[PDB]
């Protein structure tokens, strides 16, 4: 294929578009880029390990990868205390070396390997219009994805377990012996409203549900992989979809935008797959923690926190949710759907329980609430912690803030890319992506509007 | 041929005075619903307890507001992020008191504007155009989504969505600055560059085209009549415009390719607005503007003020007064 | 509300007079 504008029709700034029909070069680009991803995983892990002070919390040190490893149950014990630093190092080293291998392969295919693969092999050669081959590649990758989900399941069940922040006796790494395979729970998660108090799938709150849903995901992905290997797209799919490389790219871009938004919300709200031990409190958690901290302090001072009415007439410390549940008062009324391992022991069937509040509060809960209140996910861009009017002496931005902001931004720009490529794929399939033909300008053959 | 096929040809018809299309089949109902509810509420909605402290705020004209002060008030802080449709209220009066109209209008409006963007793509496809006008429109859509949905989601309440009113908009902005220092956020600076530069480039482009108009009229009639709709020839001399501009600054800073020029005109404000929309969307997660409070110390250790410290003083002044009865505890975390 | 007692006359004329100016000019156009 050509490597300039005259021979390709694409400028340098759209040079990767020149690869659309060079399957070998495209494969090289993909493999090298995968090498970039794995390289970042390894290098960032080693950086985080090197810059890790293991007696300080992870979320106080700007770490986003080490929490992922800790959640999987590696190198941590009860309450998230880092037992062994070596497994983090091993994850990083393995990713770095494998990235070397992937980069070598991507360079080979991009620079010297065969330009196209179709006259080399039918198995690896593909045509974008070859619907059966495209569904074959879908099938292979679906099988792989289901296998990866089952790898998560195997780690949680047979290889030491995963970190369970809801464990009795304290959050700890525990082995999940009874995943919920019950499809009612698993698929009723997908039907929950994406609004406050329901939290469509962000509300999954126990590792049994997570592991069981991953068993279901693995089975679904593998069976769909086989289904796509053994069939071709049906008539309705053929009549509804654009069948081109750019169209498939646009479809994947839409999917990725959806996943990016979901991940940003997930890290912002969920404290089960993102234990606060490693990611710090959620904003909801920190607000509730402040309310709890001052309930505890004022109660020790002698305030009768059940009957103390605030300035507006609502309870200063306790109040009712619009459905009647007893909740913390103040602005944190909006966060009454929050559930956390440190707060549920004080919750009764009706909400917060006066008897537990008056005699069941443990010193570790007070310490945890103070920590979470002071590590609220508020911070400046230059990493000054606290409310924006605070002064420069607290260097902290929550990992939840970093992850949520970054992935909302990436989700948005991938929605933009999906719009761009979907529109372009449609126009190119219909053949007017290069502009209006003067001879057959469609609007010239149309009746005037009025 | 078939009834469904006939309906399809009608909806996707390019001969309709207003294109409907499949995105239009969602846009029209949702936008009409939002408009009717907005007008009704703006005129006649009763006061809304936005802060969830039984402190209702009058937003409608009939309850003492003018056009500037009137608004559709965001739903109650007690609701938070809960879905509050009409059928979850004990009565219409309860729904009104808790700010249900805001949720109805906002949700329908958001669906409508996303469908408007899809409809722009659809009509471009039906007319044989290039497909990317909707990409430009995605910038205002991103900004509106940031202020009506994303920011309330990150903050955890639709009470922290932008009110549907003029003064409500100003209140939103002032509180936002107090809590996030949006002025000192580089994405908002990029938004300001986007709009200032977009207006600048609009003024230059319009003035350079108007300046280089080919003489086709007399001094009496409007020069606008020198252009005939659908004429093939060019109505201005782009070469003269390039000569003027390349001598105003220097030759190589002036576009002589109209296509590159118009791409630049499209791209600058759109990119700026994308950046500012992302700025609001990320300040939704309290990743705030720069904090240089007490960044400059003298040798002894006393703080030397900068303009950032004066700005922080203004922010604190806004911060301590806003929602004066809503806070019970020392830190404004919610 | 105790509003300015000249508000109604001011607003109505503010709209009305330019409105009739435009109406006159438009309707006579083509004479």
């Amino acid at each position: 294929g050509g490597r300039d504008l005259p021979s390709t029709g694409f400028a340098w700034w759209s040079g990767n578009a020149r690869l659309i029909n060079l399957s070998g070069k495209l494969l090289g680009a993909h493999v090298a880029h995968a090498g970039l991803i794995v390289f970042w995983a390894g290098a960032m892990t080693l950086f985080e390990v090197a810059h890790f002070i293991p007696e300080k919390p992870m979320y106080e040190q700007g770490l986003i990868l080490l929490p992922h490893i800790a959640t999987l149950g590696w190198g941590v014990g009860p309450a998230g205390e880092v037992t062994d630093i070596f497994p983090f190092f091993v994850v990083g080293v393995l990713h770095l070396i494998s990235s070397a291998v992937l980069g070598l392969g991507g360079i080979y295919h991009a620079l010297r390997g065969p330009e196209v693969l179709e006259e080399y092999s039918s198995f690896f050669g593909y045509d974008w219009k070859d619907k059966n081959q495209m569904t074959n590649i879908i099938g292979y990758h679906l099988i792989l994805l289901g296998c990866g989900a089952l790898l998560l399941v195997f780690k949680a069940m047979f290889f030491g377990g995963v970190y369970d922040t809801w464990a009795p006796g304290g959050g700890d790494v525990r082995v999940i012996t009874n995943p919920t395979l019950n499809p009612a729970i698993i698929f009723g998660y997908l039907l929950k409203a994406p609004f406050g108090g329901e939290g469509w799938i962000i509300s999954v709150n126990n590792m049994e549900d997570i592991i069981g849903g991953h068993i279901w995901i693995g089975l679904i992905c593998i069976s769909g992989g086989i289904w796509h290997i053994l069939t071709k797209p049906f008539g309705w799919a053929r009549r509804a979809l654009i069948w081109s490389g750019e169209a498939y790219l646009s479809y994947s871009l839409g999917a990725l935008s959806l996943m990016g938004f979901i991940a940003s919300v997930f890290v912002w709200f969920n404290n089960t797959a993102y234990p606060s031990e490693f990611y710090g409190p959620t904003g909801m958690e920190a607000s509730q923690s402040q309310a709890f901290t001052f309930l505890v302090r004022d109660q020790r001072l002698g305030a009768n926190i059940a009957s103390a009415q605030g300035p507006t007439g609502l309870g200063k410390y306790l109040m009712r949710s619009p459905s009647g549940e007893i909740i913390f008062g103040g602005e944190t009324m909006r966060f009454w759907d929050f559930r956390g391992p440190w707060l549920e022991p004080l919750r009764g069937p009706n909400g917060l329980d006066l008897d537990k509040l008056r005699n069941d509060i443990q010193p570790w809960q007070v310490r945890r609430a103070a920590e979470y209140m002071t590590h609220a996910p508020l911070g400046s861009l230059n990493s000054v912690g606290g409310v924006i009017t605070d002064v420069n002496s607290f260097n902290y931005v929550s990992p939840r803030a970093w992850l949520a902001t970054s992935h909302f931004v990436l989700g948005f720009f991938f929605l933009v890319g999906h719009l761009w490529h979907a529109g372009r794929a449609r126009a190119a399939a219909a053949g007017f992506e290069k502009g209006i033909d003067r001879e057959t300008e469609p609007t010239l053959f149309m009746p005037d509007l009025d | 041929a078939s009834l469904w096929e006939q309906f399809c040809q009608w909806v996707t018809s390019t001969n309709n005075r207003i294109y409907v299309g499949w995105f239009g089949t969602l846009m029209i109902p949702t936008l009409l619903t939002a408009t009717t509810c907005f007008i009704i509420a703006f005129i006649a909605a009763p006061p809304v307890d936005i802060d969830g402290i039984r402190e209702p705020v009058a937003g409608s004209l009939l309850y003492g507001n003018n056009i500037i002060s009137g608004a559709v008030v965001p739903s109650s802080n007690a609701i938070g992020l809960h879905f509050y449709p009409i059928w979850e209220a004990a009565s219409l009066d309860e729904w009104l008191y808790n700010g249900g109209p805001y949720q109805l209008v906002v949700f329908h409006f958001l669906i409508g504007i996303f469908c408007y963007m899809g409809r722009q793509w659809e009509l471009s496809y039906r007319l044989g155009m290039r497909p990317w006008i909707c990409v430009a429109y995605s910038a205002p859509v991103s900004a509106a989504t940031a202020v009506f949905l994303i920011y309330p989601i990150g903050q955890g309440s639709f009470s922290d969505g932008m009110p549907l009113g003029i003064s409500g908009t100003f209140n939103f902005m002032i509180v936002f600055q107090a809590e996030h220092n949006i002025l000192m956020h580089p994405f908002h600076m990029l938004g300001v560059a986007g709009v200032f530069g977009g207006s600048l480039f609009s003024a230059m482009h319009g003035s350079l085209v108007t300046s280089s108009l080919v003489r086709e009229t007399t001094e009496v009639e409007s020069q606008n009549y020198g252009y005939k709709f659908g004429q093939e020839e060019e109505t201005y001399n782009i070469v003269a415009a390039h000569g003027y501009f390349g001598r105003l600054i220097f030759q190589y800073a002036s576009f002589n390719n109209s296509r590159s020029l118009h791409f630049f005109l499209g791209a600058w404000p759109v990119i700026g607005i994308w950046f500012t929309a992302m700025g609001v969307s990320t300040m939704a997660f309290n990743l705030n503007g720069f904090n240089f409070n007490q960044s400059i110390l003298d040798s002894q250790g006393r703080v030397i003020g900068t303009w950032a410290d004066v700005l922080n003083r203004a922010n604190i002044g806004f911060e301590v007064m806003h929602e004066r009865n809503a806070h019970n505890f020392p830190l404004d975390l919610a | 509300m105790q509003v300015n007692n000249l508000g109604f006359i001011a607003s109505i004329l503010f709209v009305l007079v330019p409105t009739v100016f435009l109406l006159i000019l438009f309707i006579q156009t083509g004479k």
């Binding site: 005037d448 509007l449 009025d450 | 005129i43 004209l61 009939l62 003018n66 056009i67 005939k228 709709f229 659908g230 | 509300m1 509003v3 508000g7 109604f8 607003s11 109505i12 709209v15």
Partner: peptide, 30 residues
């Protein structure tokens, strides 16, 4: 009664919109 004035001006703007769309001067190619 200033509500009447506000409603009046808003309705004037909306009526202008409907007439400007429905009864616009048709663009004609000539």
């Amino acid at each position: 009664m200033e509500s009447v004035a506000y409603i009046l001006v808003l309705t004037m703007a909306l009526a202008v919109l409907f007439f400007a769309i429905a009864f616009r001067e048709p663009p004609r190619i000539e």
